[PDB]
Amino acid sequence: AMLQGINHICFSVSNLEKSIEFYQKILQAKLLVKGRKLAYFDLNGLWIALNVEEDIPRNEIKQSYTHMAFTVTNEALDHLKEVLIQNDVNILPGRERDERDQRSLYFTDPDGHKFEFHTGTLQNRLEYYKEDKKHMTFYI
Amino acid sequence: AMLQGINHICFSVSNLEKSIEFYQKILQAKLLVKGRKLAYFDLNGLWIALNVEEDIPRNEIKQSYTHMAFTVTNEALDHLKEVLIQNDVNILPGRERDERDQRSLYFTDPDGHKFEFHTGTLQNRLEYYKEDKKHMTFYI
Ligand SMILES: [Cl-]
Ligand SMILES: [Cl-]
Ligand SMILES: [Zn+2]
Ligand SMILES: [Zn+2]
Ligand SMILES: [Zn+2]
Ligand SMILES: [Zn+2]
DSSP states (O other), X not given: OXXXXXXXXXXXXXXXXXXXXXXXXXXXXXXXEEESSEEEEEETTEEEEEEEOTTOOOSGGGGOOOEEEEEOOHHHHHHHHHHHHHTTOOEEOXXXXXXXXXXXXXXXXXXXXXXXXXXXXXXXXXXXXXXXXXXXXXXX | OOOOSEEEEEEEEXXXXXXXXXXXXXXXXXXXXXXXXXXXXXXTTEEEEEEEOTTOOOSGGGGOOOEEEEEOOHHHHHHHHHHHHHTXXXXXXXXXXXXXXXXXXXXXXXXXXXXXXXXXXXXXXXXXXXXXXXXXXXXX
């Protein structure tokens, strides 16, 4: 095993001030460093970087389901939904879910990066799939 | 603190077979589940999902520096470079670095998702910046 975990995630942003506010208020990340065109945050031990790229096209990202999910409790999820609405966040309509999928909220940052708050675990999902799914291969 | 860490990351992919091979051989992730249009992996405790979206445009992603970095040792980095070359991986020219930036390799998956192998830590970067940088604010 030559990799030793996530080191950092970096998001390209169009407006540093607007993005800092999102990362602080919505993702609850702690701002560590702010430069002209850069910011670093700690979110529960994860190093997040924002890098400003002002004039690049940001349309196609809307079509891709690439996304990052963070763990929240069921109680936290109901509160967070109102926080997202109060902050005029772009909330995405989620996919159809089985009860066994557990609950999620999907949304974006100002530049289209998709995020999720999720109340389940991988083990919930594997146990669900193993019980229910056909046309699938399980390797564990 | 209402978030409890990364839950999962999901990548939209154009070709499931080709992407599975990349995630196994390049990122060293363990395949857990394969469906028609979905795969799940464990990479050192991180749940990675691949979701197939065949016909979406994937050009603009090339212009954005959004990326995910994984921790490797200096020795691992030299080996991994040859693994990337041997597998015809799209290796990106990195930015200029100070020695204190520590070493990195940057590359993409088949669909343009940018990744990095990095040999430093956040604390290395903060200590460097605090010693050297002007036009910056430090909050820790
Ligand atoms: Cl079926
Ligand atoms: Cl200067
Ligand atoms: Zn998800
Ligand atoms: Zn069937
Ligand atoms: Zn990086
Ligand atoms: Zn100066």
